Structures are given as structure tokens and as C-alpha cells.
Design a protein around this ligand. Structure first.
Ligand code: 1N1
Ligand code: 1N1
Lengths: 254, 255
């Protein structure tokens, strides 16, 4: 893959952070000077072609609020993926572990960080398959960033109208999820619809039920997350507009 | 994978076509049984993808479904053996025999595809690409669908919008629309849907509420079936259990 291929002997496995479906992440050090995260992909988790597309996306996309790629080790099995290390780890556990210790003005900065990354992927026609607090990482300075792994891109004469319409306004799925994310941040890791099941939630949202307003979220902040929860997808805002609305509130409140 | 394991030497590679995941050839088992062989590429699928595909191939069976004869998992490229379809694709079969069909044969074909889908519907399986080009015909003129590359019905209910949850509840209604157009291909003798419109014009043509015109070979009652498959509201469309329910009724009426 060129310069992206790194030397394995320069790595050093030290600790374990977690395990996923497409491998296991392990904490290490690059040349014993910088902290990095290393993911060990399983032999049969993904196909060859699937890795070329996934990799091709990680090298061509770059944003300050996206998990930076340090390199990969495709010259061995299992293959590695070296990236920057996030000291604080997951955002969900971060909101619950360090709960109510950061003031409200910091909560909105977390939404801005995620909105900045999504706005970038939006400009590149990329969709987050699972946008939620559990899929966001926090670094030492409290910056929230999303990942590039597992991203998506965006029969005509045999497909129904429901499929055609979705193929043109599918980007609005990441907007609804983002709205529920702000709810998780301002609720400090509260699970959406705690008093409802999966079947219930699907029925309540269909009837118009929306998440309450976090007590730590101002009435204007609620307008942002609530703007993302519009029945008509085309009536929902874009990540560029949401970023402007978030920045607008930050200036008026801070 | 057990008894499903076939000896690559027992099969002889006597070519039929090629797909994304590999190429399909023609052969015979022990010089006595006819079957088709699929040589999947090395990097097209993953180990987990195959195990799921196979697990679905070996656990499903239906007369109108492509029967699986076996696989060769101790070989690279991995092989998948199935029954041989003398007449091959349905679209080419409708165009090569356009002058050699009866009105009862056309409706019989539609049943052969509906009977298969009805079985898939009961097992919660979905055909991602249901069309005449993905259907095969054996020597006796019986149509059969394939179960390779199917999908079942993750979506986080708590973070998904309504259009996604509503899609997961009416996912089988999408194949109904495709089935309705399939019947048009049959009674139209292989004509391309919206042959006089482009991909962008077809999408708008459906948005305006217009649909395919009735083929002259289809009767008023048969067209009502395929037309019922094309309803703006997915919930208002019938089910494959109901389509077969009707197709048989029009058969007895016109037979
Ligand atoms: C799960 C976890 N992640 C951490 N930081 C990460 N940085 C980079 C990671 C990563 O997975 N990148 C990546 C991606 C995104 C895709 C493909 C490939 C790769 Cl390599 S993960 C830290 C952490 N700890 C901190 C919070 N607790 C401290 C209390 O002791 C405990 C746990 N936990
Ligand atoms: C493309 C083609 N298929 C033919 N029969 C097949 N039987 C089994 C096939 C197969 O694909 N199974 C399968 C599936 C479904 C999934 C995964 C894996 C597998 Cl293995 S295909 C015959 C044929 N010929 C007949 C019609 N023409 C001569 C007229 O004189 C020429 C062409 N052409």
C-alpha cells in the first residue's frame, strides 16, 4: 500500500481496550514514543475486496474530528490498523463516568465535534451506519471524533417507489441519529426510551412521540435535536445547517 | 461441511456464464447426474459470509428453488454445486421461445416464481434482485429462483428514523413490486420495462402514479394481479401468499 505499510517490529502490544466484530483493538506504542491503537482483524471477518474498499476510504478521508489513520500492516496475517489513541475512550462511558463534572458549555462542544465530522463525511457522500454515543471516542483534551471504519457511500425498473425515494434522501438517517446523540450527551449517557422496549419505541415514534428535553439542555438546544426528529426526512436539516445552528447557540450562550 | 462435501475430481468441468463472486460452469457428477458448478473467487466473499450463505443453502429446500447438490470446501477456489437448468435464464428463455408459448404456460411460469417466493416469505427471506434475468428454467419449463445472496430481516430502533423502521416492517412488500414487473416480463415476452424511458424518466414515471401497460397476452384478471403488486402504499400491496392464492384462481378460471 506504499508508505502506509509500517514495520511490525516497531509496534508494541501492551493492553486491551475492547473487541469488535471485525477484530480486536489493542493498546500499544509506536517506536516506544507515541501512544497508538492497534486493531487485529480476524481472518474470516472481512473479504479481500472488502478490505481494499475500507482501506481506500481511510486513506482518502481526513478531518481533525475523524480518527486519524497512522498506518496498517497488510504484509501479515492478521492485518493491523494503527490509529491515534483516544485517552478517554468511548463517549457513552465518558458521559457516565465523568458525569456532571463538565459544565453545560462543554456539552455543546461535544455535539459540535461530531457535527463537524459528519458535515465532512456528508460533503463526501458518506453515511454513518451506526451514529451513537457508543461509537464515538474522546481524546485527552475532550475532543469527540467518529471513525472511518465501516462507512457507507451514496434495479430501477424493478424497485418500488419506497426504495427510489429512500435512495435520494437516505442522508437524513444520519440526521435523526445525530439528534438522538445530542440527547445522549445532554442526558449524560441516558439510554433513549428507558421505559420502552424495541417494539414499543418503533410504535411510539410512528405515533409522533419524541425524546423528552434533557434538563441540562436549553430550550434552544432542544430545537436543534428536535429539528432532527421530523417525520418527513426532507423536512430535516443538514449537517452544515446544524453546525451553523450549534455555533449560533454557542455564541449566544457563551 | 459434512456429507455436503463433494469430491472435485468426481465432477468434470465440461462454460455457462460469470458473476461477481465467481464463474459458473457446466459439469456432471460421476457421469450420471447433471449439475452446475460455481467457482467463487478468493477475495469476493469472506469466511463468515460463506458460512452464512451455506447455512442458508443447506437448510432451505423447495421444488421451485435451485437445489444444492454439494460444495467443495477443501479447494481454492471454493466450489458450489447445484442442479442444472437446461433452459438457463428466464429472460433469454422468453425471448428465444417467443413464438412457442401458450397462455396457460405464461401463467404457469408466474406460479413457479410465486410458489418459491411464498416459501421464502414464510422463512422471512428477501430477494435483493428479483427479476427475469435472475430466474432459471429447467428442461420441463419450470421456473426456479435462487437462494444464494439472500437477506433476512442490525437497525437500532432507538436511533433510526421512521422511514427505516417502516421499511423493516414492510420489507417483503418490496419484492412484491419486483414480482409484479416480473409478470410483465413474462407476458411481454422479454420486453424491457419502460423500454421507452430512461432510469431518471422511469423514477418520475412512477412518482406520477403511472405503471406498466397491460401486455396484450395477459387477460384482464391476470393484469389485476400484477397491477395489485404496484401500489404506492406498501402496506396496501398483497403478500406472496395472497398472489399465489390469486394466480391459482385465474388458472382454474382459464383452463
Ligand atoms: C474502547 C476504548 N478505546 C480507547 N481509545 C481508542 N483510540 C482509537 C481506537 C480505535 O479503535 N480506532 C480504530 C477505529 C475507530 C477503526 C478501525 C481501527 C481502529 Cl485502530 S480506540 C480507549 C479506551 N479506554 C479509555 C477509557 N478507559 C480508561 C480507564 O482506564 C478505559 C478504555 N477504550
Ligand atoms: C447461465 C446459465 N445457466 C444454466 N443453468 C444453471 N443451473 C444452475 C445454475 C446456477 O447458477 N446455480 C447457482 C446459484 C443459483 C447460486 C449460487 C451458485 C450456483 Cl452454482 S445455472 C444454463 C445455461 N444455458 C442454458 C441455455 N442455453 C442453452 C440453450 O440451448 C445456454 C445457457 N446458462
Amino acid at each position: 500500500y506504499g508508505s502506509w505499510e509500517i514495520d511490525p517490529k516497531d509496534l508494541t502490544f501492551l493492553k486491551e481496550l475492547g473487541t469488535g466484530q471485525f477484530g480486536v483493538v489493542k493498546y500499544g506504542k509506536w517506536r516506544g514514543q507515541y501512544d497508538v491503537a492497534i486493531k487485529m482483524i480476524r481472518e474470516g471477518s472481512m473479504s479481500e475486496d472488502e478490505f481494499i474498499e475500507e482501506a481506500k476510504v481511510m486513506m482518502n478521508l481526513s478531518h481533525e474530528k475523524l480518527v486519524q489513520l497512522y498506518g496498517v500492516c497488510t504484509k501479515q496475517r492478521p492485518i493491523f490498523i494503527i490509529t491515534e489513541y483516544m485517552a478517554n475512550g468511548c463517549l457513552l462511558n465518558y458521559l457516565r463516568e465523568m458525569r456532571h463534572r463538565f459544565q453545560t458549555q462543554q456539552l455543546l462542544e461535544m455535539c459540535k465535534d461530531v457535527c463537524e465530522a459528519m458535515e465532512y463525511l456528508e460533503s463526501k457522500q458518506f453515511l454513518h451506519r451506526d451514529l451513537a454515543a457508543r461509537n464515538c471516542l474522546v481524546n485527552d483534551q475532550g475532543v469527540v471524533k467518529v471513525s472511518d471504519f465501516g462507512l457507507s457511500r451514496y434495479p430501477v425498473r424493478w424497485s418500488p417507489p419506497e426504495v427510489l425515494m429512500y435512495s435520494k434522501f437516505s442522508s437524513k438517517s444520519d440526521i435523526w441519529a445525530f439528534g438522538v446523540l445530542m440527547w445522549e450527551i445532554y442526558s449524560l449517557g441516558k439510554m433513549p426510551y428507558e421505559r420502552f422496549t424495541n417494539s414499543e419505541t418503533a410504535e411510539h415514534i410512528a405515533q409522533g412521540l419524541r425524546l423528552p428535553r434533557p434538563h441540562l439542555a436549553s430550550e434552544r438546544v432542544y430545537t436543534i435535536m428536535y429539528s432532527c426528529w421530523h417525520e418527513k426526512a426532507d423536512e430535516r436539516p443538514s449537517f452544515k445547517i446544524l453546525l451553523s445552528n450549534i455555533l449560533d447557540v454557542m455564541d449566544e450562550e457563551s
